[PDB]
Amino acid sequence: SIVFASIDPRSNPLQTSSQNYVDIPGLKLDVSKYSNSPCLTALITLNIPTPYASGNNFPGGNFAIVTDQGEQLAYGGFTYSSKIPENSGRMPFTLVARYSLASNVSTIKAQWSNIRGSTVHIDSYASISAVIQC
Amino acid sequence: SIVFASIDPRSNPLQTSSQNYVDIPGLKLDVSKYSNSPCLTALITLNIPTPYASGNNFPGGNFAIVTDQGEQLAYGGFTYSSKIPENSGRMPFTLVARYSLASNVSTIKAQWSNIRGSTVHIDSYASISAVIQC
Amino acid sequence: SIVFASIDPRSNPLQTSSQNYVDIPGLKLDVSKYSNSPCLTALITLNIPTPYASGNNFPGGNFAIVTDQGEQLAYGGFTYSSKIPENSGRMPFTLVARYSLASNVSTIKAQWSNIRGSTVHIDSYASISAVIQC
Amino acid sequence: SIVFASIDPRSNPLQTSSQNYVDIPGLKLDVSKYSNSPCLTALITLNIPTPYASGNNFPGGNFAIVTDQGEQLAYGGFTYSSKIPENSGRMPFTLVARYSLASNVSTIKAQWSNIRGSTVHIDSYASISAVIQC
Amino acid sequence: SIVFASIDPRSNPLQTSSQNYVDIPGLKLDVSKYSNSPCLTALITLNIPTPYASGNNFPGGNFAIVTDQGEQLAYGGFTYSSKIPENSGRMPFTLVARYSLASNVSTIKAQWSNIRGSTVHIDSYASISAVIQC
Amino acid sequence: SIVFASIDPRSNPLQTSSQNYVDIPGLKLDVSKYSNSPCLTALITLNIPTPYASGNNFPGGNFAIVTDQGEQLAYGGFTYSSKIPENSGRMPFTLVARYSLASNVSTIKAQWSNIRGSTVHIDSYASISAVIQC
Ligand code: NA
Ligand code: NA
Ligand code: NA
Ligand code: NA
Ligand code: NA
Ligand code: NA
Secondary structure, eight states: OEEEEEEOOSSSOEEEOOSSOEEEEEEEEEOGGGOSOTTOEEEEEEEEOSOEEEOSSSOEEEEEEEETTSOEEEEEEEEOSSSSOSSOOOOOEEEEEEEESOSOOOEEEEEEEESTTOEEEEOSOEEEEEEEEO | OEEEEEEOOSSSOEEEOOSSOEEEEEEEEEOGGGOSOTTOEEEEEEEEOSOEEEOSSSOEEEEEEEETTSOEEEEEEEEOSSSSOSSOOOOOEEEEEEEESOSOOOEEEEEEEESTTOEEEEOSOEEEEEEEEO | OEEEEEEOOSSSOEEEOOSSOEEEEEEEEEOGGGOSOTTOEEEEEEEEOSOEEEOSSSOEEEEEEEETTSOEEEEEEEEOSSSSOSSOOOOOEEEEEEEESOSOOOEEEEEEEESTTOEEEEOSOEEEEEEEEO | OEEEEEEOOSSSOEEEOOSSOEEEEEEEEEOGGGOSOTTOEEEEEEEEOSOEEEOSSSOEEEEEEEETTSOEEEEEEEEOSSSSOSSOOOOOEEEEEEEESOSOOOEEEEEEEESTTOEEEEOSOEEEEEEEEO | OEEEEEEOOSSSOEEEOOSSOEEEEEEEEEOGGGOSOTTOEEEEEEEEOSOEEEOSSSOEEEEEEEETTSOEEEEEEEEOSSSSOSSOOOOOEEEEEEEESOSOOOEEEEEEEESTTOEEEEOSOEEEEEEEEO | OEEEEEEOOSSSOEEEOOSSOEEEEEEEEEOGGGOSOTTOEEEEEEEEOSOEEEOSSSOEEEEEEEETTSOEEEEEEEEOSSSSOSSOOOOOEEEEEEEESOSOOOEEEEEEEESTTOEEEEOSOEEEEEEEEO
């Protein structure tokens, strides 16, 4: 089966300058119906196709897939190749994780954080999805 | 089930300088067999791992997943961090969408468009795929 | 069903300066249980979310999905937009392939290679996965 | 998926002397979750392994699988080979039906009726089940 | 998935006095779409809930599930407990078989034959079905 | 998926005169691969299409589906309509059960027992099968 959530915050863009990971609002999957099911697994893709980051010390952004049981299932990020890019170019980002559904998991969700004092931005379509299989 | 199409236009590369979205030839999925099926959903991934864009005003490229019912299911793109990059570097791009198969859909396909008068280029492997589940 | 492998080589990073494709250790899928099954197909995603490449001639990195039957199912890569980037920025990369399981396949795996004498680096989470369906 | 209901009325046996079909209490399947799903079908088995019928004019019993939309999906029955059997022997009975789940169906259930004024009896395990597939 | 066929020959009943197995018309499954698929198996149920047999030497009827490759996957039958039953009572019959779909099979079908010169009769609902799984 | 076992003891028929349930040799399903899986269920059919029973006090036979955890999932049987049938006619028998695979189950199997001092006989094809679903 498929579980899916997307956002498209054109009118009210998202940003973070947080050094710690914080939730990306709207990018959460409810997997309660499948929990406590050791024979099931979720393959989870976080797709942030058009992010950027502003800043003045080799800016970038980090992303993670986590559960509400404190498991960091995957992480990664982008950075620029200059200290102060004259344009914060759009840097497509995708991240793929796996999680057994054996445990009492309820939520699989996206988080983000900054790098070197940057501000990370999302102002367009992004998604999180899972394929759940036996 | 899986539906899949790929291209690999090494000998005859693809390009667009179109401001409006136009089809990427060869990156189309036929989902007719699954249409009018409200209990089915497709999770669709467009993978353009090695595109670039030429131009002189912060060039880039945009991509979309659409149906032949006029639904834009997802969009995003890449841009460079300089006004006139001395090399149009390869900027891997992936985009993930979801579509209920309730409607009379026949085709799910990839489109692209330019940015600020750029020319977008594909000269190597790219794919579009879907997982269809109940 | 889902098949999955990941790495997270923070303490002992990976690198290659190989012009020919070589295996990324740890990014291998065992599909033996599904082989010789013409009604089955694998949809395979290689996710390298945080690679970079060092070098002095427009550096970058290439990646491929292959089988142990010599099939190159997909390939692509990233490159920088400068001859000698002052920072080798992190360039998220994903690649999606399809393979019929009709043949006597045992292994689907990731490979990488350099570009123009670069060194490609992985020092954090990366994965390879497949959805196997009828 | 599987939907299932059984009864085992040892302490309070069931009987009917009804000429018209009437519900067998407890032998009902709730298929509401799957309704309005044209791509789904149910394969339904009614298993009455140990019924009998009393009477004096070639007794027997009839059974049917029906929906709450007035569809009689299957029917059949047993009869004895004598006008007045000296023992109403146990006559195992099974019945298999198919139903598309396209419609607004809620319930698939078992019914029974008599033959030639008989009384039909169930005093032990019986079941109704469905396999639901795409 | 489910494959299914039924008959309900109330207006034009079926009979056989054949000593050799012959096809029951209408009780045939087309499995061509699944053939040459070693990872698939069919679980096949033949349900004849209300047959009888006439005759004067301990009459009965035999049934079989066969393919068009000459495989007899299952067989069985009913007989009466008297030499000349005064009423040929209805004797519910079900038969379950399994078949790998590895081979070039096209058809799985029902057959019947007599016993000791009997005539076997079907004048009401009967079905043949399969569940096909990986 | 399907699990299946059959017997066809033409050359060396089976019989029991046991008052207690005893295993029918060969009619056992190994479900170990699916055990400890609360999201999975088995729908189990025992098909004895051509049994009979000998004896002189309203003979018959009983059958059950059991696990190796002492669960009697289903039971039923046939009996004749005379005290001493002049021919022990063939009395087709089918029995359907359901079992959650949550527990540490290894085996689902068929048992039989006599009635009123009868001897129950199987000298031809019989099967036990399960459909296992999520
Ligand atoms: Na939840
Ligand atoms: Na189409
Ligand atoms: Na292998
Ligand atoms: Na209902
Ligand atoms: Na055919
Ligand atoms: Na076992």
